[PDB]
Amino acid sequence: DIQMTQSPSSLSASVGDRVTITCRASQSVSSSAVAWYQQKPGKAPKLLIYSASSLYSGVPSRFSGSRSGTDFTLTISSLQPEDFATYYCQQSPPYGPITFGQGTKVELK
Amino acid sequence: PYHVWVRVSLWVSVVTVAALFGWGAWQRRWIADDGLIVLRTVRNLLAGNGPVFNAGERVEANTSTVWSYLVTLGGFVAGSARLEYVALVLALTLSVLGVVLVMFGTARLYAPGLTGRRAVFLPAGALVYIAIPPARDFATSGLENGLVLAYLGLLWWMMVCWSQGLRRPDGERTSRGFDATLAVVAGMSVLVRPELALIGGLALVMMLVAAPTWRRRLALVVVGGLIPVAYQIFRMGYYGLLVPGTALAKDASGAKWDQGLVYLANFNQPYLLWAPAVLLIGLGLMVLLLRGRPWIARTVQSPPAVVAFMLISGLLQAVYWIRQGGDFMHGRVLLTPLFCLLAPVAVIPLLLPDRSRMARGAGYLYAGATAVLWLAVAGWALWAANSPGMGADATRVTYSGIVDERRFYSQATGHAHPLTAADYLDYPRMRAVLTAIENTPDGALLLPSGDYDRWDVVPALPPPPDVRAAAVGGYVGPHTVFFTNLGMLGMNVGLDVRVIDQIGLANPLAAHTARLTDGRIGHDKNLFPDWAVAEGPFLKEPPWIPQYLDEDWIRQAEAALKCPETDKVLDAIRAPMGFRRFLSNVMHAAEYTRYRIDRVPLYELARCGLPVPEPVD
Amino acid sequence: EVQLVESGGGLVQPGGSLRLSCAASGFNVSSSYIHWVRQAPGKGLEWVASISSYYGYTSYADSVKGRFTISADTSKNTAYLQMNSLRAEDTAVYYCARGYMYSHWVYSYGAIDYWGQGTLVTVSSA
Ligand SMILES: CCCCCCCC/C=C/CCCCCCCC(=O)O[C@H](COC(=O)CCCCCCCCCCCCCCC)COP(=O)(O)OCCN
Numbered sequence: 001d002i003q004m005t006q007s008p009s010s011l012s013a014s015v016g017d018r019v020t021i022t023c024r025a026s027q028s029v030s031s032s033a034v035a036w037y038q039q040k041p042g043k044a045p046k047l048l049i050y051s052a053s054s055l056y057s058g059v060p061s062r063f064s065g066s067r068s069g070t071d072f073t074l075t076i077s078s079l080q081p082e083d084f085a086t087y088y089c090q091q092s093p094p095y096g097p098i099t100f101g102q103g104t105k106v107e108l109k
Numbered sequence: 110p111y112h113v114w115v116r117v118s119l120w121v122s123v124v125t126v127a128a129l130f131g132w133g134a135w136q137r138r139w140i141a142d143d144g145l146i147v148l149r150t151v152r153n154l155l156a157g158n159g160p161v162f163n164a165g166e167r168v169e170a171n172t173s174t175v176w177s178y179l180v181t182l183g184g185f186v187a188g189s190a191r192l193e194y195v196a197l198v199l200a201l202t203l204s205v206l207g208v209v210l211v212m213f214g215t216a217r218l219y220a221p222g223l224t225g226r227r228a229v230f231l232p233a234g235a236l237v238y239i240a241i242p243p244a245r246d247f248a249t250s251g252l253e254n255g256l257v258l259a260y261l262g263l264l265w266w267m268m269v270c271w272s273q274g275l276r277r278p279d280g281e282r283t284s285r286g287f288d289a290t291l292a293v294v295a296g297m298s299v300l301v302r303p304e305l306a307l308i309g310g311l312a313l314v315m316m317l318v319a320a321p322t323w324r325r326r327l328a329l330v331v332v333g334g335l336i337p338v339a340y341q342i343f344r345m346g347y348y349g350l351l352v353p354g355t356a357l358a359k360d361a362s363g364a365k366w367d368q369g370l371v372y373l374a375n376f377n378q379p380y381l382l383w384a385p386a387v388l389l390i391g392l393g394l395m396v397l398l399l400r401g402r403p404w405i406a407r408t409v410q411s412p413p414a415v416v417a418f419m420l421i422s423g424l425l426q427a428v429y430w431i432r433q434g435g436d437f438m439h440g441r442v443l444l445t446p447l448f449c450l451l452a453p454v455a456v457i458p459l460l461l462p463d464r465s466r467m468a469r470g471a472g473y474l475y476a477g478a479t480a481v482l483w484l485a486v487a488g489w490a491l492w493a494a495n496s497p498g499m500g501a502d503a504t505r506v507t508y509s510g511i512v513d514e515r516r517f518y519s520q521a522t523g524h525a526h527p528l529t530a531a532d533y534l535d536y537p538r539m540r541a542v543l544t545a546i547e548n549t550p551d552g553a554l555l556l557p558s559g560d561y562d563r564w565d566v567v568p569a570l571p572p573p574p575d576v577r578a579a580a581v582g583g584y585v586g587p588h589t590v591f592f593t594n595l596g597m598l599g600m601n602v603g604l605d606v607r608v609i610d611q612i613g614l615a616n617p618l619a620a621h622t623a624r625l626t627d628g629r630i631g632h633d634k635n636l637f638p639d640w641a642v643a644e645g646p647f648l649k650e651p652p653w654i655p656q657y658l659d660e661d662w663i664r665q666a667e668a669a670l671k672c673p674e675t676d677k678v679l680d681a682i683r684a685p686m687g688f689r690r691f692l693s694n695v696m697h698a699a700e701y702t703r704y705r706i707d708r709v710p711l712y713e714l715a716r717c718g719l720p721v722p723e724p725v726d
Numbered sequence: 727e728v729q730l731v732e733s734g735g736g737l738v739q740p741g742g743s744l745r746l747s748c749a750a751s752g753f754n755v756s757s758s759y760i761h762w763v764r765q766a767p768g769k770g771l772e773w774v775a776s777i778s779s780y781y782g783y784t785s786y787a788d789s790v791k792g793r794f795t796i797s798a799d800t801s802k803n804t805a806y807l808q809m810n811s812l813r814a815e816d817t818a819v820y821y822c823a824r825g826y827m828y829s830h831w832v833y834s835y836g837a838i839d840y841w842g843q844g845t846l847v848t849v850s851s852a
Contacts, residue, residue, distance in 0.1 A: 047826075559831040
């Protein structure tokens with residue numbers, strides 16, 4: 001069984017700041033199929049990052065991802081007021097089961 | 110042996126039909142992808158390797174057993190290296206011969222009742238069949254449709270003669286040679302097509318009914334089925350199965366009536382097939398009244414029985430194909446029942462009614478209705494010949510899988526008449542495979558690439574020293590190609606390159622897998638490429654494989670392939686052939702036929718009872 | 727435009743049965759992967775089941791392995807999920823989604839492209 005531990009759980013940031021979120025796995029992640037999602041309260045999630053380093057079509061350039069070995073990181077630079085949501089890290093082999101992480105929430109102050 | 114106008118009329122009518130049909134089949138010249146799969150087996154057989162798709166395995170890929178050997182004989186006689194022309198010529202000749210045979214057989218049915226009368230013969234059911242555009246599409250492809258037409262025409266003529274032959278010359282129905290010939294012809298039906306057996310076997314039963322004693326019944330049953338029994342023994346000994354293998358790959362679960370009804374509606378709606386049926390039924394029920402409105406052995410061998418036999422055969426074939434689920438082609442599998450149903454009305458007589466039934470003006474009005482009905486049928490045929498066809502939905506994958514293959518492959522390539530394998534080099538992934546093979550002297554496994562229209566390469570293990578040097582004309586490694594369309598690749602790559610598919614037409618591993626989900630007709634049961642990587646002399650590590658393959662799955666499949674029961678089935682078709690191999694294959698064919706494996710390697714391991722390999726990490 | 731429309735859901739007695747449907751537009755279900763995902767109130771996301779019609783492959787989670795069933799009807803471009811023996815802790819909003827595939831062949835990136843709106847199922851009663 002693969003488990004992902006996402007940290008931290010709540011971030012306090014203001015407009016025009018830098019935000020980093022780290023998702024950590026346990027076993028081998030040679031799949032490198034970590035993807036990041038965004039969900040606003042009462043809506044369906046949106047894809048941002050795929051293959052742990054690749055940016056989806058239509059997503060602004062502020063979003064970035066990096067693979068620090070077993071650690072994975074999402075980066076946002078100079079956040080706008082329309083970026084306060086909940087984010088999820090996900091892992092999946094080519095056919096294998098999907099595993100999500102514990103979401104993180106960002107507030108404004 | 111009748112009057113002059115009856116003799117000439119029939120003749121000219123026959124000629125007319127033949128001519129038109131020939132022209133209709135020359136303006137639509139093509140060869141299907143499925144027609145190029147027979148030619149690879151023919152090439153292997155003429156090369157000295159045997160009736161196989163690939164040199165190292167004994168797998169049956171042809172479901173006709175008569176078309177393949179006929180084409181092999183034709184290609185042996187013809188010293189030219191081109192085999193598409195042989196198929197073209199044979200298909201054309203067989204189709205024309207079948208139509209002529211059925212017309213001539215139907216004429217003798219009506220001949221006895223025309224003695225001392227003035228009448229003419231007119232083509233009714235022959236024109237209707239050749240007016241349908243898909244009938245002329247499949248009159249020249251690489252399939253065995255013309256063989257079926259010729260066989261059915263010969264059987265119809267022979268059965269009509271047998272039924273009318275009752276004259277009691279010497280207390281016997283007919284001669285013994287005719288009976289033996291008819292029995293052999295009837296028994297030869299299973300080899301041509303399997304489902305055709307229900308026709309031929311039925312005929313056999315009728316003969317068994319009319320025999321006077323048990324001795325004649327035993328003689329007939331022994332003579333009728335010798336060749337099919339011998340070929341069944343050979344197939345069991347050689348291939349190790351009871352079935353060709355393509356039928357083994359599919360794992361049916363029940364009837365599909367809704368898909369069959371959809372297929373029937375799709376066939377009908379372009380051309381409005383109900384109007385000719387209504388008109389021909391009217392003509393048939395009208396011609397019978399003029400002949401007159403009005404123990405088991407005499408009844409079975411009677412002209413009324415053969416008409417019912419033909420109609421029942423057609424209805425049964427239609428029901429079988431509708432229950433099966435249809436096909437993914439526009440009208441391919443519904444042409445044999447149509448040919449069977451139209452046989453009794455292939456030609457109709459027009460004559461002035463007798464004085465002893467209707468007097469003067471009552472006979473002048475009976476011919477007018479027949480003439481008008483024939484004119485209406487001819488008008489329908491002329492309209493339906495120039496029909497656009499299926500429509501602007503035969504180029505994409507719609508909610509149903511039915512498509513028109515001829516236009517699909519005409520637009521897929523850039524040729525209006527794609528007849529040879531050099532015409533198919535313009536398919537989007539065809540020119541790249543040659544360069545991919547030529548750029549890998551040491552061999553590799555070729556897979557479709559998900560980013561572009563080229564191929565992905567998985568290298569093979571390098572040869573050891575003292576084995577690379579000891580090679581004739583240089584060293585060439587093993588090349589394998591994994592794809593879905595085999596004819597164009599098979600007729601191009603060569604006889605030393607292994608060409609495999611995913612459904613299981615030529616893949617022995619994918620034909621022994623079970624079914625979980627129904628899906629689309631014919632494109633629903635595909636094996637993972639990880640199984641292909643697992644078996645083969647190729648590398649299995651992430652620095653040499655694409656990123657869409659799982660290495661844990663590869664290790665699990667490699668560990669699962671060593672099951673003791675899988676090994677026996679594998680060496681049944683790979684060990685060198687001898688005498689003990691033939692006997693062992695005969696004794697164990699039944700259990701090899703009913704053998705299944707699981708798609709997912711982990712569940713296979715669980716079923717067999719083998720330990721799970723450690724994670725690669 | 728790609729659309730996924732979901733229907734079927736409500737109150738059911740514990741130990742009851744309820745079926746779910748999802749209609750697809752703009753693509754064929756015969757060449758893409760379909761997933762079901764749920765979200766319990768005040769909780770995160772959780773994968774339920776997946777299907778592939780091109781390969782004949784079906785997969786389930788360990789919690790609902792023996793009681794749920796996912797199929798596909800390619801004639802109508804619809805996917806189904808039968809739910810039996812619904813214990814009271816199976817109440818959540820259920821989503822249907824599509825996988826992100828390669829352009830020129832049937833391979834997956836391991837991610838999800840398009841998400842449906844959702845249909846909540848309450849498996850409690852009384
Ligand atoms: C259409 C689907 C049918 C399925 C169900 C099975 C039905 C089986 C019924 C048939 C048996 C009874 C009718 C046929 C027998 C007619 C008599 C016959 O063949 O005689 C012969 C008459 O000449 C013939 O061959 C004409 C008889 C057949 C005419 C009707 C043709 C049937 C086909 C039309 C319907 C198909 C058109 C629609 C196409 C989709 C001569 O024999 P004889 O020496 O005169 O001795 C007999 C005494 N008259």
